[PDB]
């Protein structure tokens, strides 16, 4: 009977962060029900329904001119915005009759290793609340921050390496910096890399896998240059 709107909040993370997983303490600022009210608006069993407005501070007047119009009239006698309550001092003080107040709570969202971009982590019922509404959810969406060396593809890592024509034709070492602080030396044999479209594939060197474990591959691409 009236669901409250969700609060969507995306959380960025570097590829290296989604590599080892991360935990973030988040501060949630939201509208909550009056504590010294319990949402009532007044003292237990005090507030009284608006007789002049069987619900909200709303009344309908029908004036004429050319045609007849139904002009919605607000302030219902002893109400409006609050079609009820009344009684000078049976009302909060901590909510002055507005039935709601601010609350700052902390949530710890755990970004598990291998979490894909756009991934959702749902916090049931933590959204804003108002008297009558079923509070919605606080939805975090993992956003993959841009990277200066890798591109992600599912559970792999794509890396464009710039190699010399000489290395490519004679073969030799070659190294890159994995999302995990570890440095990685790669060896290639003569000619292996020069073909158009060539891709080198290195076993479990590319990102943690959500359901299960292990890792995807590290797919390498080559850009070959030769001076002068």
């Amino acid at each position: 009977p009236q669901r409250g709107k969700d609060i969507k909040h995306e959380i960025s993370a570097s590829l290296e962060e989604l590599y080892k997983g991360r935990t973030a303490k988040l501060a949630l600022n939201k509208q909550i029900l009056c504590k010294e009210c319990e949402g009532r608006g007044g003292k237990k069993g005090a507030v009284k329904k608006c007789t002049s407005c069987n619900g909200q501070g709303i009344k309908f007047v029908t004036r004429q001119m050319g045609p007849m119009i139904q002009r919605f009239q607000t302030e219902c006698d002893v109400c409006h915005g609050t079609g009820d309550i009344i009684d000078p001092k049976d009302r909060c003080k901590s909510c002055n009759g507005k039935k709601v107040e601010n609350e700052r709570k902390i949530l710890e969202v755990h970004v598990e290793p291998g979490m894909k971009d756009g991934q959702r982590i749902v916090f049931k019922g933590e959204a804003d609340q108002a008297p009558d509404v079923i509070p919605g959810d606080v939805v975090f969406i993992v956003s993959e921050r841009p990277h200066k060396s890798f591109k992600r593809d599912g559970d792999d890592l794509v890396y464009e390496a710039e190699i010399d024509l000489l290395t490519a034709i004679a073969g030799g070492e070659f190294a890159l910096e994995h999302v995990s602080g570890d440095w990685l030396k790669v060896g290639i044999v003569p000619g292996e890399v020069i073909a158009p479209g060539m891709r080198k594939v290195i076993e479990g060197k590319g990102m943690p896998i959500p359901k299960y474990g292990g890792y995807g591959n590290l797919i390498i691409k080559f850009t070959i240059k030769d001076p002068e």
Binding site: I7, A24, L26, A27, L28, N29, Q31, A127, D128, V138
Partner: peptide
Amino acid sequence: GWLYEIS
């Protein structure tokens, strides 16, 4: 409702 990271 709105949020921010602590620390």
